[PDB]
Amino acid sequence: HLESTSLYKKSSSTPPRGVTVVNNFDAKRYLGTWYEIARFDHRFERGLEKVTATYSLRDDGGLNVINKGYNPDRGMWQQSEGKAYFTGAPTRAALKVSFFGPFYGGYNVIALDREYRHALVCGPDRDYLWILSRTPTISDEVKQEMLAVATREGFDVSKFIWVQQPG
Amino acid sequence: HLESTSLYKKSSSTPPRGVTVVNNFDAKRYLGTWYEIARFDHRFERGLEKVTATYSLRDDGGLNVINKGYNPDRGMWQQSEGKAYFTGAPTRAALKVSFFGPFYGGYNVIALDREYRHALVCGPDRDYLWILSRTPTISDEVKQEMLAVATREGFDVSKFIWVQQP
């Protein structure tokens, strides 16, 4: 049901001890819009609800990233744009991504279903984790499975904020 | 994010040393109803709850001002009707306001969000300050931004009364 992963380490881009990263990735199936179902309390997203990320293919072989979110303390929709590059082979879902302004960090897909409907992504350390989905909600069954992989890879899943989404 | 301002100083209308006043004001967007979220304990408003200020355009280029509130001591709603005129250009949010007789008070918009949803308004010295909003409550983030501008402009934010609103 899930894509194959293997242990993967790159200095400064992956968490200590490495993490299991997707190793037969097909970037074209990753394109388009994902809803952020859950995130750790990342400073660059603080406050945001109804968050999505939209990926598109660039001529230089990277991805454009469009981040959208609603700030309920301002009552406003916000958008920001970034870029993503593979750090090695494009079959390995390890990227560097601009998370705020010109600052890039590691972006590692550590679980992904074979139909590219749901993903667990971690940043360069264990303070950065996301659950992404093609739909604004996920099943309890998908939630359990994603939480289980995160726990196995050493993350503390009680740090998740469950992001408000439609439905 | 907030509208641009510039320093405006005029004795009797602004506080001493002047205050930063909005300088790209579009009065049509300021029209309609605002809730008074907070005020410094002004004697003409003492005890009032559920206070609103309503602005409408006059033919002569001023604003009609209606200040309304519930007075628990009287067990009655109360309102005062005044007129406000720009002291300078209509893009500068500094007005003079009269309700009784040939006497005028300064009204200076010193913070305003670009969507005209919240504003910080001062009078002729630092005993006169208001937070206005299009909604009867504001978020903590918006509250903190207004309190910071107030402090920047020399006001003592411990003087705010947080007005009773729905």
Short mmCIF file of all heavy atoms in Angstrom, two decimals, chain A residues 135-167:
data_model
loop_
_atom_site.label_atom_id
_atom_site.label_comp_id
_atom_site.label_asym_id
_atom_site.label_seq_id
_atom_site.Cartn_x
_atom_site.Cartn_y
_atom_site.Cartn_z
N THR A 135 -6.89 15.28 -0.25
CA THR A 135 -8.19 15.73 0.23
C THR A 135 -7.99 16.49 1.55
O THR A 135 -7.01 16.20 2.23
CB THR A 135 -9.09 14.54 0.51
OG1 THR A 135 -8.39 13.58 1.32
CG2 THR A 135 -9.36 13.80 -0.79
N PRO A 136 -8.88 17.41 1.86
CA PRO A 136 -8.78 18.21 3.09
C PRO A 136 -8.96 17.39 4.39
O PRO A 136 -8.51 17.87 5.43
CB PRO A 136 -9.82 19.32 2.88
CG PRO A 136 -10.76 18.79 1.98
CD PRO A 136 -10.04 17.88 1.06
N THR A 137 -9.55 16.21 4.33
CA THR A 137 -9.57 15.27 5.46
C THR A 137 -9.04 13.95 5.06
O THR A 137 -8.99 13.64 3.87
CB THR A 137 -11.00 15.08 6.04
OG1 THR A 137 -11.87 14.55 5.03
CG2 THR A 137 -11.66 16.41 6.41
N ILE A 138 -8.62 13.18 6.05
CA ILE A 138 -8.19 11.84 5.86
C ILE A 138 -8.96 10.93 6.79
O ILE A 138 -9.48 11.37 7.84
CB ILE A 138 -6.68 11.66 6.09
CG1 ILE A 138 -6.26 12.04 7.52
CG2 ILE A 138 -5.88 12.43 5.04
CD1 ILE A 138 -4.80 11.75 7.78
N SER A 139 -8.98 9.67 6.39
CA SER A 139 -9.57 8.62 7.20
C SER A 139 -8.77 8.38 8.47
O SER A 139 -7.55 8.59 8.53
CB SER A 139 -9.66 7.33 6.39
OG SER A 139 -8.40 6.81 6.07
N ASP A 140 -9.43 7.86 9.50
CA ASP A 140 -8.72 7.44 10.71
C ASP A 140 -7.70 6.41 10.44
O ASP A 140 -6.63 6.37 11.06
CB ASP A 140 -9.69 6.89 11.77
CG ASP A 140 -10.65 7.94 12.28
OD1 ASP A 140 -10.30 9.13 12.21
OD2 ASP A 140 -11.77 7.64 12.79
N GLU A 141 -7.97 5.55 9.46
CA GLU A 141 -7.04 4.50 9.12
C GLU A 141 -5.72 5.05 8.53
O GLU A 141 -4.63 4.60 8.86
CB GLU A 141 -7.72 3.54 8.16
CG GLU A 141 -8.83 2.72 8.86
CD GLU A 141 -10.19 3.40 8.96
OE1 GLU A 141 -10.42 4.52 8.43
OE2 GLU A 141 -11.10 2.79 9.62
N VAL A 142 -5.86 6.04 7.66
CA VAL A 142 -4.67 6.70 7.07
C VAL A 142 -3.93 7.46 8.17
O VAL A 142 -2.74 7.36 8.26
CB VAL A 142 -5.11 7.63 5.91
CG1 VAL A 142 -3.97 8.53 5.45
CG2 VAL A 142 -5.56 6.75 4.78
N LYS A 143 -4.66 8.15 9.03
CA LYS A 143 -4.06 8.88 10.17
C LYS A 143 -3.21 7.95 11.04
O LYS A 143 -2.03 8.20 11.28
CB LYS A 143 -5.17 9.56 10.93
CG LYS A 143 -4.84 10.37 12.17
CD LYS A 143 -6.06 11.28 12.44
CE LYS A 143 -6.50 11.36 13.90
NZ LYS A 143 -7.70 10.52 14.34
N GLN A 144 -3.77 6.80 11.42
CA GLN A 144 -3.02 5.83 12.24
C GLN A 144 -1.77 5.37 11.59
O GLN A 144 -0.72 5.17 12.24
CB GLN A 144 -3.83 4.56 12.54
CG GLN A 144 -4.91 4.70 13.52
CD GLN A 144 -4.47 4.55 15.00
OE1 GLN A 144 -3.63 3.69 15.37
NE2 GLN A 144 -5.13 5.32 15.84
N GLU A 145 -1.84 5.11 10.28
CA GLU A 145 -0.69 4.58 9.58
C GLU A 145 0.41 5.63 9.48
O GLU A 145 1.56 5.34 9.68
CB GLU A 145 -1.09 4.12 8.18
CG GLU A 145 -0.01 3.27 7.53
CD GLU A 145 -0.59 2.34 6.43
OE1 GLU A 145 -0.82 2.81 5.27
OE2 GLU A 145 -0.85 1.13 6.75
N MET A 146 0.03 6.86 9.17
CA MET A 146 1.02 7.95 9.11
C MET A 146 1.65 8.20 10.49
O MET A 146 2.86 8.38 10.59
CB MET A 146 0.39 9.25 8.60
CG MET A 146 -0.07 9.25 7.12
SD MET A 146 1.20 8.90 6.01
CE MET A 146 1.14 7.25 5.77
N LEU A 147 0.84 8.22 11.51
CA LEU A 147 1.37 8.39 12.90
C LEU A 147 2.30 7.29 13.29
O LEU A 147 3.29 7.53 13.96
CB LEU A 147 0.22 8.48 13.87
CG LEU A 147 -0.65 9.73 13.77
CD1 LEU A 147 -1.87 9.66 14.65
CD2 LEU A 147 0.19 10.98 14.07
N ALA A 148 2.01 6.06 12.87
CA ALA A 148 2.86 4.92 13.16
C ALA A 148 4.21 5.01 12.49
O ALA A 148 5.24 4.73 13.10
CB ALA A 148 2.12 3.59 12.79
N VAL A 149 4.27 5.43 11.22
CA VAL A 149 5.56 5.60 10.59
C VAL A 149 6.38 6.70 11.27
O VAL A 149 7.55 6.55 11.46
CB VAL A 149 5.41 5.93 9.06
CG1 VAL A 149 6.77 6.29 8.48
CG2 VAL A 149 4.84 4.74 8.30
N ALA A 150 5.73 7.82 11.61
CA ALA A 150 6.40 8.97 12.26
C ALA A 150 7.00 8.49 13.59
O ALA A 150 8.11 8.81 13.93
CB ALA A 150 5.44 10.12 12.49
N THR A 151 6.25 7.65 14.29
CA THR A 151 6.72 7.15 15.61
C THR A 151 7.88 6.26 15.46
O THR A 151 8.87 6.38 16.17
CB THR A 151 5.58 6.48 16.28
OG1 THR A 151 4.58 7.46 16.61
CG2 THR A 151 6.01 5.89 17.62
N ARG A 152 7.84 5.40 14.44
CA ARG A 152 8.92 4.50 14.14
C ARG A 152 10.18 5.23 13.75
O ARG A 152 11.28 4.80 14.07
CB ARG A 152 8.48 3.60 12.98
CG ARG A 152 9.46 2.54 12.55
CD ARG A 152 9.04 1.94 11.22
NE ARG A 152 9.51 2.75 10.09
CZ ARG A 152 8.96 2.78 8.87
NH1 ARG A 152 7.87 2.06 8.60
NH2 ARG A 152 9.47 3.53 7.93
N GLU A 153 10.04 6.38 13.06
CA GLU A 153 11.20 7.14 12.63
C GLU A 153 11.69 8.11 13.68
O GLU A 153 12.52 8.96 13.41
CB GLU A 153 10.85 7.86 11.33
CG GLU A 153 10.72 6.93 10.14
CD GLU A 153 11.88 5.95 10.04
OE1 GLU A 153 13.04 6.40 9.93
OE2 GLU A 153 11.65 4.70 10.11
N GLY A 154 11.10 8.04 14.87
CA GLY A 154 11.60 8.75 16.04
C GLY A 154 11.04 10.11 16.34
O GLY A 154 11.57 10.84 17.21
N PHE A 155 9.94 10.47 15.66
CA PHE A 155 9.34 11.75 15.85
C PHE A 155 8.32 11.59 16.99
O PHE A 155 7.77 10.49 17.16
CB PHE A 155 8.60 12.22 14.61
CG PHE A 155 9.49 12.53 13.49
CD1 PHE A 155 9.98 11.51 12.68
CD2 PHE A 155 9.80 13.86 13.20
CE1 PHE A 155 10.80 11.82 11.62
CE2 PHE A 155 10.60 14.16 12.11
CZ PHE A 155 11.14 13.13 11.37
N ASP A 156 8.04 12.67 17.69
CA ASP A 156 7.03 12.72 18.75
C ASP A 156 5.71 13.26 18.20
O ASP A 156 5.54 14.47 18.04
CB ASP A 156 7.49 13.64 19.87
CG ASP A 156 6.49 13.75 21.01
OD1 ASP A 156 5.38 13.12 21.00
OD2 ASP A 156 6.72 14.52 21.96
N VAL A 157 4.83 12.34 17.82
CA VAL A 157 3.60 12.73 17.10
C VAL A 157 2.62 13.56 17.94
O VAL A 157 1.69 14.17 17.39
CB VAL A 157 2.92 11.54 16.43
CG1 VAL A 157 3.81 10.94 15.36
CG2 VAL A 157 2.56 10.53 17.45
N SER A 158 2.83 13.64 19.26
CA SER A 158 2.01 14.49 20.09
C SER A 158 2.34 15.99 19.89
O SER A 158 1.60 16.87 20.33
CB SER A 158 2.05 14.01 21.56
OG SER A 158 1.36 12.73 21.64
N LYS A 159 3.38 16.28 19.10
CA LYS A 159 3.72 17.66 18.74
C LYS A 159 2.84 18.14 17.57
O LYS A 159 2.85 19.32 17.24
CB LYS A 159 5.19 17.78 18.38
CG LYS A 159 6.11 17.47 19.51
CD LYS A 159 7.41 18.13 19.36
CE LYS A 159 8.27 17.40 18.49
NZ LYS A 159 9.53 18.22 18.22
N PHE A 160 2.12 17.24 16.92
CA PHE A 160 1.30 17.72 15.77
C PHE A 160 0.21 18.72 16.15
O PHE A 160 -0.50 18.53 17.16
CB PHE A 160 0.64 16.54 15.05
CG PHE A 160 1.43 15.91 13.98
CD1 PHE A 160 1.56 14.50 13.95
CD2 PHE A 160 1.97 16.65 12.91
CE1 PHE A 160 2.25 13.87 12.96
CE2 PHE A 160 2.67 16.01 11.93
CZ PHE A 160 2.79 14.61 11.91
N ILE A 161 0.03 19.79 15.36
CA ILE A 161 -1.15 20.58 15.26
C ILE A 161 -1.99 20.00 14.13
O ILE A 161 -1.47 19.79 13.00
CB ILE A 161 -0.79 22.05 14.90
CG1 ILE A 161 0.05 22.69 16.00
CG2 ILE A 161 -2.00 22.86 14.62
CD1 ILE A 161 0.90 23.86 15.50
N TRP A 162 -3.23 19.71 14.43
CA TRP A 162 -4.18 19.18 13.46
C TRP A 162 -4.85 20.38 12.83
O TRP A 162 -5.61 21.12 13.44
CB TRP A 162 -5.14 18.19 14.15
CG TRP A 162 -4.35 17.05 14.59
CD1 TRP A 162 -3.74 16.88 15.82
CD2 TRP A 162 -3.97 15.94 13.80
NE1 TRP A 162 -3.02 15.72 15.83
CE2 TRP A 162 -3.16 15.11 14.61
CE3 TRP A 162 -4.28 15.51 12.49
CZ2 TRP A 162 -2.64 13.92 14.16
CZ3 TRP A 162 -3.73 14.31 12.04
CH2 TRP A 162 -2.92 13.53 12.87
N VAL A 163 -4.49 20.64 11.57
CA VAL A 163 -4.79 21.90 10.92
C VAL A 163 -6.25 21.96 10.52
O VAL A 163 -6.81 21.00 9.97
CB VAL A 163 -3.87 22.09 9.64
CG1 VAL A 163 -4.23 23.35 8.90
CG2 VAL A 163 -2.40 22.04 10.00
N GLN A 164 -6.92 23.07 10.81
CA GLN A 164 -8.32 23.19 10.41
C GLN A 164 -8.45 23.24 8.89
O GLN A 164 -7.74 23.96 8.24
CB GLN A 164 -8.94 24.47 10.95
CG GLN A 164 -8.98 24.47 12.47
CD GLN A 164 -10.37 24.17 12.90
OE1 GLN A 164 -10.60 23.18 13.59
NE2 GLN A 164 -11.32 25.01 12.49
N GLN A 165 -9.32 22.40 8.35
CA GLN A 165 -9.54 22.33 6.91
C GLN A 165 -11.05 22.24 6.67
O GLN A 165 -11.73 21.77 7.55
CB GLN A 165 -8.91 21.04 6.36
CG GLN A 165 -7.34 21.00 6.41
CD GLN A 165 -6.68 21.94 5.41
OE1 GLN A 165 -7.35 22.60 4.64
NE2 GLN A 165 -5.35 22.00 5.43
N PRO A 166 -11.53 22.55 5.46
CA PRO A 166 -12.94 22.23 5.09
C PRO A 166 -13.34 20.77 5.37
O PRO A 166 -12.61 19.83 5.08
CB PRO A 166 -13.00 22.51 3.58
CG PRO A 166 -11.77 23.31 3.22
CD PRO A 166 -10.79 23.25 4.39
N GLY A 167 -14.52 20.55 5.95
CA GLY A 167 -14.91 19.23 6.43
C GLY A 167 -14.18 18.91 7.73
O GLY A 167 -14.42 17.87 8.36
#
